[PDB]
Amino acid sequence: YILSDTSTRVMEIDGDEFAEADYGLVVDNSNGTQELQQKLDTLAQAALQTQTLSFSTITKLYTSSSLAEKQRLIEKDEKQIRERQAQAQKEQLEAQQQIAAMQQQQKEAELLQKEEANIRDNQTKIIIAQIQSE
Amino acid sequence: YILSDTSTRVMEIDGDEFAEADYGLVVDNSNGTQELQQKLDTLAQAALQTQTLSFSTITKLYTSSSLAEKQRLIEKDEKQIRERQAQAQKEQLEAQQQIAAMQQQQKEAELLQKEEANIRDNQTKIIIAQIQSE
Amino acid sequence: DYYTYEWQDIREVRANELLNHYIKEYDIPLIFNNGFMDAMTCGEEIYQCD
Numbered sequence: 001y002i003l004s005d006t007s008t009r010v011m012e013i014d015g016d017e018f019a020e021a022d023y024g025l026v027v028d029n030s031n032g033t034q035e036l037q038q039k040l041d042t043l044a045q046a047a048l049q050t051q052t053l054s055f056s057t058i059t060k061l062y063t064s065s066s067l068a069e070k071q072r073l074i075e076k077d078e079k080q081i082r083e084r085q086a087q088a089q090k091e092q093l094e095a096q097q098q099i100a101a102m103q104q105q106q107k108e109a110e111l112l113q114k115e116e117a118n119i120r121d122n123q124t125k126i127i128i129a130q131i132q133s134e
Numbered sequence: 135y136i137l138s139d140t141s142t143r144v145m146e147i148d149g150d151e152f153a154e155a156d157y158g159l160v161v162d163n164s165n166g167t168q169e170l171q172q173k174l175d176t177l178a179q180a181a182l183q184t185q186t187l188s189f190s191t192i193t194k195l196y197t198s199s200s201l202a203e204k205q206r207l208i209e210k211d212e213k214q215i216r217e218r219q220a221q222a223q224k225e226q227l228e229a230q231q232q233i234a235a236m237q238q239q240q241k242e243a244e245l246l247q248k249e250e251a252n253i254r255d256n257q258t259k260i261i262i263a264q265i266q267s268e
Numbered sequence: 269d270y271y272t273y274e275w276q277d278i279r280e281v282r283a284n285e286l287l288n289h290y291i292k293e294y295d296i297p298l299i300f301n302n303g304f305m306d307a308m309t310c311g312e313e314i315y316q317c318d
């Protein structure tokens with residue numbers, strides 16, 4: 001109840017006997033981590049405006065209590081939107097190109113129509129030359 | 135009368151014989167949960183303006199009394215606007231495509247008319263030369 | 269979303285979810301506050317974690 005799905009399965013990947021300061025994790029109340037916490041929420045507030053982080057994400061940042069989860073949410077929400085803007089640029093590029101394709105397909109259809117329109121005048125001129133000659 | 139429809143239903147689950155602090159819930163008056171109530175109510179106001187949160191839901195946030203209820207309400211209405219803004223973009227995207235669809239078929243209707251028009255002048259022209267030959 | 273996470277990150281979330289809960293449950297900042305009064309009176313400040 002106090003841990004997540006992924007947090008409870010850590011007990012299986014081995015060595016949890018060994019202290020956390022052997023695996024690179026220390027308990028730190030010092031001016032480094034309050035400066036990193038005050039930076040990481042100011043950065044999120046500057047990312048809330050300019051439509052870079054959703055209102056779903058920032059409330060997860062306020063209820064995280066760990067500087068690495070709230071770091072990964074800034075990273076995850078930037079990659080999602082920058083993927084969405086890059087495909088929105090792509091779909092708007094091909095849409096004007098298929099518009100450029102459908103206008104091109106009809107004007108050569110106009111172009112092929114006037115050449116088949118002309119020859120049937122020309123061959124029927126051969127017919128009206130042919131009938132009275134008998 | 136003091137509880138909701140959902141809140142009277144957790145008694146049916148086999149857990150309310152035990153303390154609440156065994157399921158991750160504690161009472162807290164600290165600098166932690168007091169900062170969260172500010173950070174939710176300030177984020178509510180920045181969501182009220184810029185048209186992201188409605189006036190009906192803001193009245194629910196002021197009379198909410200739970201920091202996780204008003205977390206689930208700001209995420210509720212933000213998901214409601216992002217689906218409306220996505221579908222209105224897609225409705226506007228298909229609208230320009232279907233106008234371009236009906237303008238395409240009408241100029242092909244100008245195209246298909248003038249090929250069947252001119253041949254009708256041609257086939258009647260062969261009737262002229264065939265009558266005079268008798 | 270746990271593909272962008274790291275192994276040192278998942279170990280760090282689990283460590284904080286243990287520590288953020290039990291600090292708020294037992295009210296540990298008061299246990300450390302009684303221990304300061306023995307620090308100024310004995311010169312000793314001892315705790316057992318069991």
Ligand SMILES: [Mg+2]
Pocket residue numbers: 135136137
């Ligand atoms: Mg009532």
